[PDB]
């Protein structure tokens, strides 16, 4: 246990984690404006253009292979990955929209 703790302890961060939040946090304040109403960002450009999407999307990929979506990520009934990798990944996928 002495050699285990002597080998365990020198884990030096190469710079810091305070070097990552030091040079990222801006000294300038929030200063909100009509800025936020001016945006219409891209993921809400998907939402605001629902009529053009609903009217102009017609064509379908008429040829597909089923059970290829499960194999492309490696999560199926048998693979090199473990048992709850597909379960925790399918649950974190199941929550994220």
Partner 1 sequence: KLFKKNNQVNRVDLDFLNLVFTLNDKDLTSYHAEEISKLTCVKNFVEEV
Partner 2 sequence: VTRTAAHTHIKGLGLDESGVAKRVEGGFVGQIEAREACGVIVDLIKAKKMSGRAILLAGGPSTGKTALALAISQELGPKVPFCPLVGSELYSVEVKKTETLMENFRRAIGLRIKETKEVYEGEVTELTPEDAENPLGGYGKTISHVIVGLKSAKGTKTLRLDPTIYESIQREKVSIGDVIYIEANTGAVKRVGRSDAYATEFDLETEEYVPLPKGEVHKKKEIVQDVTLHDLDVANARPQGGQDVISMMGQLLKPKKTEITEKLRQEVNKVVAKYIDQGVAELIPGVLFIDEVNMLDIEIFTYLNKALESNIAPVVVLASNRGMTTVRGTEDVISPHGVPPDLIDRLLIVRTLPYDKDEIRTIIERRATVERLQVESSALDLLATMGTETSLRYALQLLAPCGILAQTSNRKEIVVNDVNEAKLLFLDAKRSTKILETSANYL
Partner 3 sequence: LKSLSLIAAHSHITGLGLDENLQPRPTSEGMVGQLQARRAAGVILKMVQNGTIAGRAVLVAGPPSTGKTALAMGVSQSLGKDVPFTAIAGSEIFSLELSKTEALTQAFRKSIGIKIKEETELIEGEVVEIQIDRSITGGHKQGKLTIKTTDMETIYELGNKMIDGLTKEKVLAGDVISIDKASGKITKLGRSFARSRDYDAMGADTRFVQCPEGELQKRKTVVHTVSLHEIDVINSRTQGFLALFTGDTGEIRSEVRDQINTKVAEWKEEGKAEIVPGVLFIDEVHMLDIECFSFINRALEDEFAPIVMMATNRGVSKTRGTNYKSPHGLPLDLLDRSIIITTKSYNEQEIKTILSIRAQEEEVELSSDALDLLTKTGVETSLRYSSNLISVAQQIAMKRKNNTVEVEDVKRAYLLFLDSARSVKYVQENESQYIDDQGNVQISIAK
Among 1, 11, 38, 72, binds partner 2 (CB under 8 A): 38
Closest CA to 74 of 64, 83, 62: 83
CA–CA dist 23, 42 (Å, integer): 28
Q: C-beta of 24: minimal distance to partner 3 in Å? A: 7
Pick the closer one to partner 2 by CB: 36 or 62.
36
CA–CA dist 53, 35 (Å, integer): 27
Residues at the contact surface with partner 2, assessed by CB under 8 A: 14, 29-33, 35-36, 38-39, 41-43, 81-85, 88-89
């Amino acid at each position: 246990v002495n050699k285990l703790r002597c080998d365990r302890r020198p884990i030096f961060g190469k710079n810091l984690i305070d070097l990552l939040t030091k040079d990222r946090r801006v000294k300038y304040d929030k200063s909100s404006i009509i800025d936020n109403e001016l945006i219409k960002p891209l993921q809400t450009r998907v939402l605001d253009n629902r009529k053009i999407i609903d009217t102009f999307a017609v064509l379908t990929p008429s040829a597909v292979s089923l059970d290829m979506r499960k194999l492309a990520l490696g999560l199926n009934d048998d693979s090199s990955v473990g048992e709850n990798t597909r379960l925790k990944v399918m649950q974190n996928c199941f929550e994220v929209s």
